[PDB]
Amino acid sequence: GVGISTGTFNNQTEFKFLENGWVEITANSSRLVHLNMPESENYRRVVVNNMDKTAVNGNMALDDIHAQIVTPWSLVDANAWGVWFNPGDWQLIVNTMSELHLVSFEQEIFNVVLKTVSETKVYNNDLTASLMVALDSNNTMPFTPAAMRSETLGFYPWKPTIPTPWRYYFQWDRTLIPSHTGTSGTPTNIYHGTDPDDVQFYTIENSVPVHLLRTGDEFATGTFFFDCKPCRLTHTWQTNRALGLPPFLNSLPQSEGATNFGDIGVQQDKRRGVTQMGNTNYITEATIMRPAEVGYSAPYYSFEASTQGPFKTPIAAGRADGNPRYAFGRQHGQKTTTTGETPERFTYIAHQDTGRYPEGDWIQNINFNLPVTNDNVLLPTDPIGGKTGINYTNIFNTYGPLTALNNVPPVYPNGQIWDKEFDTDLKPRLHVNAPFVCQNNCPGQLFVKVAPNLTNEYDPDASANMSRIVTYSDFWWKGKLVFKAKLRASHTWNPIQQMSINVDNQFNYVPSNIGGMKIVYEKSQLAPRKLY
Amino acid sequence: GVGISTGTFNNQTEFKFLENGWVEITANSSRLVHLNMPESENYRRVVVNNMDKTAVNGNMALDDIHAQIVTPWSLVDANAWGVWFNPGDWQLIVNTMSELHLVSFEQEIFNVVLKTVSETKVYNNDLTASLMVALDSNNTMPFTPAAMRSETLGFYPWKPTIPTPWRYYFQWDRTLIPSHTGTSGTPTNIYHGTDPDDVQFYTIENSVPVHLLRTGDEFATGTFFFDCKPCRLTHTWQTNRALGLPPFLNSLPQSEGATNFGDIGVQQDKRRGVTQMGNTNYITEATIMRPAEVGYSAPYYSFEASTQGPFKTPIAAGRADGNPRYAFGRQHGQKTTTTGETPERFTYIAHQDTGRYPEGDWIQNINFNLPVTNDNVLLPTDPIGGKTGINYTNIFNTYGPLTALNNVPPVYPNGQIWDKEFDTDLKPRLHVNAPFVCQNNCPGQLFVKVAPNLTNEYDPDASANMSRIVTYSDFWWKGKLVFKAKLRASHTWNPIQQMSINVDNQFNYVPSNIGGMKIVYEKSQLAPRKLY
Amino acid sequence: GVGISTGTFNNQTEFKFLENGWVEITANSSRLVHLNMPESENYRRVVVNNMDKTAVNGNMALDDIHAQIVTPWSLVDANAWGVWFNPGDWQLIVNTMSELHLVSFEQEIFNVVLKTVSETKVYNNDLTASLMVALDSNNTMPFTPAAMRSETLGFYPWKPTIPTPWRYYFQWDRTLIPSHTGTSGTPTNIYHGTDPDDVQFYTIENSVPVHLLRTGDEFATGTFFFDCKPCRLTHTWQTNRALGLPPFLNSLPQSEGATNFGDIGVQQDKRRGVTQMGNTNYITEATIMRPAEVGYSAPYYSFEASTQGPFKTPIAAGRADGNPRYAFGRQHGQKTTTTGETPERFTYIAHQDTGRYPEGDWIQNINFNLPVTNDNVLLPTDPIGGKTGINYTNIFNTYGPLTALNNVPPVYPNGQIWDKEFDTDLKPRLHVNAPFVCQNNCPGQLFVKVAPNLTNEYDPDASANMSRIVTYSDFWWKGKLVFKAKLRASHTWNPIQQMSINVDNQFNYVPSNIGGMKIVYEKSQLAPRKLY
């Protein structure tokens, strides 16, 4: 009946140790989730069109034109690290573990409460009303990770949280020709509507069964199981210069200090080795044949425009370009006592040295007369197409068979845990948004809604919105995400980098006078790893 | 369902008589515990700083500076004697039983009722809301015995009671250089913040499971089992002067009265026996060797300072130095019909003679010429450091390998029953606050809270505190605390001191005209026992 | 056979993971040890008498007068942390473990080579000479921890080492009456000789069976197994002021910032609680009855005289006094390429707050009037004995039955691992120099010597010392030490302090331009632990 509890609340992280240095990290999590009824029971097709902003020349990158189907449902999304680990648990993981697997995931909605607002205000229990709950176990609906809009569940167990009102992308065609300031024409900036071939109008009611939980009942998902390749909590320092055997230092220093450098004792054009610039006798530090290329140069800040308008091309690793800029509100790390709509932001400068420094690059003629003349060398200071501010590195691309990369690091507390693989025939090698990629299916999105409490005056043949007795739900969500992780080993003599509390960062991890609480970014990959 | 009770109030105590002179005393205690919702859901960090009162010189001992983590949860603490035994039961224990063991302890919360307040006031039941209940079975939370503040459950079975709002100490660093009145200038009274090395921030949600009871189901703790050493309900009178064989008396008195003393026959330098004064022939009751020292002189009213500011050095046995002074409110013994904030107070003058009388002490020179001259004896009339008010016994310690001591007596009704042993590598001989001390684990602290009963207006991103439906709960708590105790035997001819109702103390044990009740303090070690 | 190798070098650390969160840590250590022949074969009794330095008044603590037996043997001592663990392994231990047991120890000598020098210098193999090796399995000889003098095996595997020449204390009687500068005359400073009742002359030749290893043979000390209680790698932040339930705060702060404190609502004389002060109604955080006493005050820089001369009385834990100060050489952590004789030094400021701050002490009269008048309070500024520098806290001792204490922390690399328990009938609670103390037996000391290669001219009747063929030995030593440690768990929300490499300490842990090395000290007890 009504008065019997339908479950329990758990936010314990349990570390169970196993054979051979493995640990099973059972990250229990639980939250009180609050849900108002939808603005309308209908599905809407809404077009956003900021021609007011993009019609100003030069503001082409501020295009927000898109079409979306607004759904009368809300999504309970736990796909962010902050939902699962408090910072001490994260410290234990990143300091102690080396590689990290994702094992299982399960959810439960329980202790549903429904309450109506009446008349001053009087709140009364709707013991007869129901909470509609759907689990897209078959991945029928379009996938939408809430982390990329900072819309996941909250990161504090003691604060209630809300689900995101769900929406998905309808198809549209849009063209936006680039223009700079002072072009003095009108660029073609128009919206073409929808290709009829590519129309899709999903609905929760047709796609998936819906359970009508009243108050004394509980919903439990199955125990999902992943098959992902490992994430690694260790970074690589070795660029191309670091791979392989250094040259023999024939003349070592005889006294201490920084000024006493060591010298290679043989002329550069009578050294012994192998090089790929075959016409050149010089075997330098920079020209000797390495096995492969670590990382790749990319055309940074370039936009392709498919039919759906311009978009920034992704970059695998940063030096700046590449390093993501997470921005988030008060559920998700900002000081909860802050006043204002301005979000807190950080750029995650990853530890991995896989990236590039474009100002050091250059191209030069095949003849390779080493005291290069200006005509024989193309430098980052040189213009392309007459534009002083654009140089060749902005358009350059060195991706090739010899390129070697690392998967993107975890980004606690805001970043994703998992993402689903593309449905394409040829599939991307790495996802820039999440470390683990579900290979063939991913956890079903859990959609939640409060059923219509109709008024006695309702008449479906009338055109106006149906009068609904105002009702809202509070319900408890429980989740259990299991990881399998390997404890590290101290291969090297020296101590490694480790996450630590210090005088500077102390008060980020304890509340203020008035319960002001925050969570700060903590770097996931700390220990160096021998790439070669 | 809703309408079915889930437990029986029981405040009896059985005395079950086992073979071989042991009684299993089962104490049951039941209380209606009333719980308002917390002032704020967020964990707060609050520093208290009475610089204003400690900056005036001489007020060093009034130092109240501390930091604490004010917590939404409230604690149900039953660790006091008055919760379990009434004066009649306590009489039957102390008057008849020589030693007392703890056996087991268990708790049950039952018959939860949740109610909501709406503005005149109308009180309505909320069958959907839930009491949040958590048990720290693992003792992972910081231990907080409520008896030291007199915030335990109430000691009357009929009155309802309230649980203590929970809080625990945080790190802080402080220096308070002392100063008498008339000091030239201000001492360094300053607060240094918190060491990052020492930060521990605990939360119930991340540490222990939590149960969302609602109105219809119970929470029950398994039978915890103690292993503590016996508390002995009998006191020792024998000072060093009363250990061993008294001297032989040659001239016994021949008539009655106090004037007719008996005399030892032979001169003090011609007596026989063992002294521990190698250069002295006088054998006297002060000088004759004894097996060991009962009790120890300790530096009385010595305040001692750590990183966290000054504190009193505790003392194991009092004579009024050392003897504990309890201040307590109307839940816990004061006459309930009295007005005013002012607590009732007693000082527990224990029977046992393990204490000291500092004004009688003295130290004299090794040479030990008998009628000791002024220069050769240091008396308690003599000033250390020129301070007339501070004689040597204030600065004096005689703890040693020969010190013998008793455990602290039980104090009824306010004294603690059990206490947790320290996680130090070297553990103290006794705790001055409770007779029994848990060797390896102690009963789990029971935390309670009422869930956030939100309103429709809630937005987690809003800076202001969440709007909550004003909720309170009453839940019946039932405890069962089992002891095992040994019946005494009459070894002496003479009868022993006993607790008794008399014309003076009569009306302390029955209610007043308007139903006021009190519980006076009762002495727990009445029968004398043989030390040697 | 001469040429067959007799062992294998091993300096690896294996971290082997057991059930239930235990890690078996197998530290292997291997060294080359160089042993010249003794200066003379005879046992020598030598007395050191530095009257030239201590006859100057005030040079009392510079007393070095002692007697010792200078023994031809040399001791191979591995009893120090740096012999076994490098900084990376120690980082893993301190950052990831919680308690650390000590399991077993074994030793080996292998690949012995003997050589002789003939006059330019010619080096010739001594195929027939032998190295005397003696294990004192029964501990007949006095235990002699070389780490006290910083003469253990060196901490670098790739650098040879030399063993300490063995010596032990003979008995001597001494009196040194102290004096200050400007004392009237030369005080008693005399060497009395030796008490015949206490004479003990030990020879390795008579007390242990001596093995003779030529070149093709080994000696393997079988596995000794310890039974020591665990060392804890966590530190206790709570002092007495932070034990128990904090006082309830009525005036919670309503705005951010350190300058907005909370306040207790109730006046100090109307405040509920318990105090060990029978005549004081003021309950305050200094006076409230804590369970026991964490730490203790001791007479700081007190020197005490035995039969054999003055010595520093030791202190269990420091704030300064009590904190150990190490002086160590090139083998044991100093920059190996430094010129000069001066040792490198550090003072190990342990993280535990069990120490005292003597400037905050005060003692006040039993009446306890609050604005204390000068006569009624003794401060650390007041003179005692008429001396202005010495104050009462130099004499004071707070040690009592209520004292709780922590064991000595590990000090990496120069501190001991184990030490032998004293043979006294009552044994100390702790040792100030090793974390583990062997309960009944401790691993045997290994004494090494190169046997005499006599010349043909030898005659025992000759007055002069014998003639020897100048010879020395190099032998490879290997040892294995096994620990059993428990991995930590993240109880707190907040991260803990952790050992890390950073820009300040980066070049401490890696070799220099001309191959220098150092080992900087590293703190053991990092993570906080709760007492109560």
**Domains of chain C and any CATH numbers:** 1-532 (2.170.30.10)
CA–CA distance from A13 to each of A110, A302, B207 (Å)? Answer: 20, 43, 8
Distance of CA B427 to the CA centre of its chain: 18
| Residue indicated by tokens 């080579």 | C113
Judging contacts by C-beta atoms under 8 Å, the chain C residues touching residue B395 are: 363, 378, 392, 395-396
As a whole number of angstroms, the distance between CA A426 and CA C164 comes to 70
**Token pair belonging to A458:** 């309702």
Q: 3-class DSSP state for residue A92?
A: helix
3-state secondary structure C363-408: EECCCCCCCCCHHHEECCCCCECCECCCCHHHHCCCCCCCEEECCC
Residue set of the binding site of C for Mg(2+):
138
CB contact under 8 A, C88 and A510: no
Q: Which amino acid is at B158?
A: W
Distance of CA A386 to the CA centre of its chain: 37
User: Contact, B166 vs B74, CB < 8 A?
Assistant: yes
User: Which of C360, C397, C531 is closest, CB to CB, to B422?
Assistant: C531
CB contact under 8 A, C248 and B167: yes
As a whole number of angstroms, the distance between CA B71 and CA B204 comes to 9
Q: What are phi and psi of B355, to 5 degrees?
A: -85, -165
As a whole number of angstroms, the distance between CA C16 and CA A347 comes to 39
Residue B373: CB atoms within 10 Å: 9
- Burial, C465: exposed, middle or buried (Cβ in 10 Å; 0-12, 13-18, 19+)? exposed
Judging contacts by C-beta atoms under 8 Å, the chain C residues touching residue B63 are: 284-286
As a whole number of angstroms, the distance between CA B137 and CA B208 comes to 8
CB contact under 8 A, B302 and C497: no
CB contact under 8 A, C494 and A87: yes
CA nearest neighbour of C329 among C345, C314, C313, C316:
C345
User: Which of C17, C95, C256 is closest, CB to CB, to A17?
Assistant: C17
Judging contacts by C-beta atoms under 8 Å, the chain C residues touching residue A262 are: 513
Which residue spans within B161-233 are E strands per DSSP? 164-169, 174-176, 189-191, 210-212, 219-220, 224-225, 231-232
Vertex A281: Cα angle to A277 and A286 (nearest 5)? 55
Q: Which amino acid is at A12?
A: Q
**Token pair belonging to B145:** 């015995």
As a whole number of angstroms, the distance between CA A501 and CA C496 comes to 6
Q: What are phi and psi of C196, to 5 degrees?
A: -65, -25
**Token pair belonging to C12:** 């690896």
User: Contact, A105 vs A226, CB < 8 A?
Assistant: yes
CB contact under 8 A, A514 and B44: yes
User: Contact, B518 vs B87, CB < 8 A?
Assistant: no
DSSP string, A111-138: EEEEEEEE---EEEE-TT--EEEEE-TT
The helices-and-strands tally (H runs, E runs) of chain C is 4, 30
- Element spanning A73, H or E: strand A66-76
Q: Are strands C445-450 and C66-76 parallel, antiparallel or unpaired?
A: antiparallel
| Residue indicated by tokens 């014309």 | B503
As a whole number of angstroms, the distance between CA A478 and CA A168 comes to 26
CB contact under 8 A, A12 and B209: yes
As a whole number of angstroms, the distance between CA B294 and CA B315 comes to 14
CB contact under 8 A, A88 and C493: yes
For C336-344, the CB contacts below 8 A with 24+ separation are C336/C156, C336/C159, C336/C515, C336/C516, C336/C517, C336/C518, C337/A256, C337/C512, C337/C514, C337/C515, C337/C516, C338/C516, C343/C150, C344/C518
Q: 3-class DSSP state for residue B196?
A: helix
- Element spanning A204, H or E: helix A204-207
As a whole number of angstroms, the distance between CA A182 and CA B520 comes to 93
CA distance B225 to chain A (A): 26
| Residue indicated by tokens 């590039």 | A356
Residue C65: CB atoms within 10 Å: 19
Close Cβ partners of B281 (under 8 Å, ≥ 6 residues apart): B269
Close Cβ partners of A236 (under 8 Å, ≥ 6 residues apart): A294, A352, A353, A354, A406, A528, A529, A531
As a whole number of angstroms, the distance between CA B380 and CA A98 comes to 68
Q: What are phi and psi of B52, to 5 degrees?
A: -60, -40
As a whole number of angstroms, the distance between CA B273 and CA B294 comes to 21
User: Contact, A234 vs A528, CB < 8 A?
Assistant: yes
3-state secondary structure C215-245: CCCCEEEEEEECCCCCEECEEECCCHHHCCC
CB contact under 8 A, B116 and A123: yes
User: Contact, B411 vs B318, CB < 8 A?
Assistant: no
Q: Is the peptide bond before A314 cis (omega within 30 degrees of 0)?
A: no
Q: 3-class DSSP state for residue A167?
A: strand
Q: 3-class DSSP state for residue C360?
A: helix
Residue A252: CB atoms within 10 Å: 13
| DSSP 8-state class, residue C26 | E
| DSSP 8-state class, residue B526 | -
Judging contacts by C-beta atoms under 8 Å, the chain A residues touching residue B459 are: 162
Chosen from B325, B328, B393 to mutate, greatest number of chain C CBs within 10 A: B325
**Token pair belonging to A171:** 């198809």
Q: Which amino acid is at B458?
A: Y
Q: Is the peptide bond before A413 cis (omega within 30 degrees of 0)?
A: yes
User: Which of A127, A154, A515 is closest, CB to CB, to B44?
Assistant: A515
Residue A361: CB atoms within 10 Å: 16
Q: What are phi and psi of A270, to 5 degrees?
A: -125, 25
CB contact under 8 A, B461 and A2: no
User: Which of B49, B145, B326 is closest, CB to CB, to C245?
Assistant: B145
User: Contact, B460 vs A162, CB < 8 A?
Assistant: yes
**Residue in C with minimal Cα distance to A496:** C501
- CB environment B452-471: b (16+ within 10 A), e (fewer): bbbbbebebeeeeebebbeb
As a whole number of angstroms, the distance between CA C524 and CA C262 comes to 36
CA nearest neighbour of B410 among B525, B331, B528:
B525
User: What are the beta bridge partners of residue B46?
Assistant: B68
Q: Are strands C471-487 and C22-36 parallel, antiparallel or unpaired?
A: antiparallel
CB contact under 8 A, A498 and C498: yes
Residue set of the binding site of C:
138
DSSP string, C428-461: -S--SS-SEEESS--PPEEEEEEPP-B-TT--TT
Chains A and B: how many Cβ contacts under 8 Å?
155
Half-sphere exposure of C204 (CA within 13 A, CB side): 27
**Token pair belonging to A470:** 């105002």
Distance of CA C409 to the CA centre of its chain: 10
Close Cβ partners of A519 (under 8 Å, ≥ 6 residues apart): A82, A87, A155, A332, A333, A413, A508
Half-sphere exposure of C240 (CA within 13 A, CB side): 29
CB contact under 8 A, B199 and A501: yes
Q: Is the peptide bond before C428 cis (omega within 30 degrees of 0)?
A: no
Which residue spans within C233-330 are E strands per DSSP? 234-236, 273-277, 293-294, 303-306, 309-312, 325-328
**Residue in C with minimal Cα distance to B176:** C360
CB contact under 8 A, A32 and B451: yes
**Residue in A with minimal Cα distance to B459:** A162
User: Which of C242, C377, C382 is closest, CB to CB, to B308?
Assistant: C242
CB contact under 8 A, A493 and C86: yes
Close Cβ partners of A258 (under 8 Å, ≥ 6 residues apart): none
Distance of CA B448 to the CA centre of its chain: 24
User: Contact, B301 vs C368, CB < 8 A?
Assistant: yes
Chain C adjacent subunits, 3+ CB pairs under 8 A: A, B
Judging contacts by C-beta atoms under 8 Å, the chain C residues touching residue A12 are: none
**Token pair belonging to B498:** 């006993």
User: Contact, B64 vs B174, CB < 8 A?
Assistant: no
CB contact under 8 A, A493 and C512: no
As a whole number of angstroms, the distance between CA B478 and CA B32 comes to 9
CA distance A394 to chain C (A): 33
3-state secondary structure C37-86: CCCCCCCEEEEECCHHHHCCCCCCCCCCCEEEEEEEEEEECCCCHHHCCC
| Residue indicated by tokens 């922590």 | C406
Distance of CA C470 to the CA centre of its chain: 36
User: H helices of B124-251, where?
Assistant: 204-207
- Element spanning A486, H or E: strand A471-487
User: Contact, C85 vs A493, CB < 8 A?
Assistant: no
CB contact under 8 A, B61 and C287: yes
CA–CA distance from A445 to each of A107, A145, A224, B435 (Å)? Answer: 10, 9, 12, 57
As a whole number of angstroms, the distance between CA C91 and CA C500 comes to 8
CB contact under 8 A, B211 and A501: no
CB contact under 8 A, B42 and A9: no
CA distance A23 to chain C (A): 9
Q: Are strands C293-294 and C403-404 parallel, antiparallel or unpaired?
A: parallel
User: Which of C88, C495, C502 is closest, CB to CB, to A91?
Assistant: C495
As a whole number of angstroms, the distance between CA C218 and CA C519 comes to 32
**Residue in A with minimal Cα distance to C337:** A256
User: What are the beta bridge partners of residue C123?
Assistant: C117
Q: What are phi and psi of C330, to 5 degrees?
A: -70, -40
Judging contacts by C-beta atoms under 8 Å, the chain B residues touching residue A157 are: 203, 205-206
- Burial, C121: exposed, middle or buried (Cβ in 10 Å; 0-12, 13-18, 19+)? exposed
Residue A414: CB atoms within 10 Å: 24
- Measure CA of the first residue to CA of the last residue in chain C; give whole Å: 65
Q: Which amino acid is at A73?
A: W
Q: 3-class DSSP state for residue C268?
A: helix
User: Which of C86, C92, C498 is closest, CB to CB, to A500?
Assistant: C498
User: Contact, B501 vs B509, CB < 8 A?
Assistant: yes
User: Contact, B34 vs C210, CB < 8 A?
Assistant: no
Close Cβ partners of C288 (under 8 Å, ≥ 6 residues apart): B148, C244, C273, C274, C275
As a whole number of angstroms, the distance between CA A142 and CA A200 comes to 10
User: Which of A88, A252, A493 is closest, CB to CB, to C494?
Assistant: A88
CA distance B2 to chain C (A): 36
Judging contacts by C-beta atoms under 8 Å, the chain C residues touching residue A96 are: 95-96, 487
**Token pair belonging to A485:** 């992780």
User: What are the beta bridge partners of residue B480?
Assistant: B28, B106
CA nearest neighbour of B93 among B417, B334, B468:
B417
Q: Which amino acid is at B226?
A: F
As a whole number of angstroms, the distance between CA B176 and CA A23 comes to 48
Distance of CA A436 to the CA centre of its chain: 11
Judging contacts by C-beta atoms under 8 Å, the chain B residues touching residue C101 are: none
As a whole number of angstroms, the distance between CA A80 and CA C90 comes to 34
DSSP string, C500-523: ---TTTGGGSS--TTS------EE
Close Cβ partners of B110 (under 8 Å, ≥ 6 residues apart): B5, B6, B7, B218, B475, B476, B477, B478
What's the resolution in A? 3.0
CB contact under 8 A, B212 and A9: yes
User: Contact, B504 vs B520, CB < 8 A?
Assistant: no
CB contact under 8 A, C500 and A498: yes
CA nearest neighbour of C57 among C181, C175, C185:
C181
CA nearest neighbour of B425 among C404, A528, C371:
C404
Chain B adjacent subunits, 3+ CB pairs under 8 A: A, C
User: Which of A96, A490, A514 is closest, CB to CB, to C88?
Assistant: A490
Judging contacts by C-beta atoms under 8 Å, the chain B residues touching residue C247 are: 48, 64, 66, 149
Q: 3-class DSSP state for residue A183?
A: coil
Judging contacts by C-beta atoms under 8 Å, the chain C residues touching residue B305 are: 356-361
CA distance B438 to chain C (A): 12
| DSSP 8-state class, residue A61 | G
Dihedral Cα B43, B47, B48, B50, nearest 10 deg: -170
CA distance A142 to chain C (A): 36
- CB environment B334-349: b (16+ within 10 A), e (fewer): bebeeeeeebbebbbe
The helices-and-strands tally (H runs, E runs) of chain A is 3, 31
User: Which of A17, A337, A501 is closest, CB to CB, to C20?
Assistant: A17
Q: What are phi and psi of A196, to 5 degrees?
A: -65, -25
Close Cβ partners of B175 (under 8 Å, ≥ 6 residues apart): B188, B189, B190, B192, B305, B309, C357, C359, C360
- Element spanning A420, H or E: strand A418-420
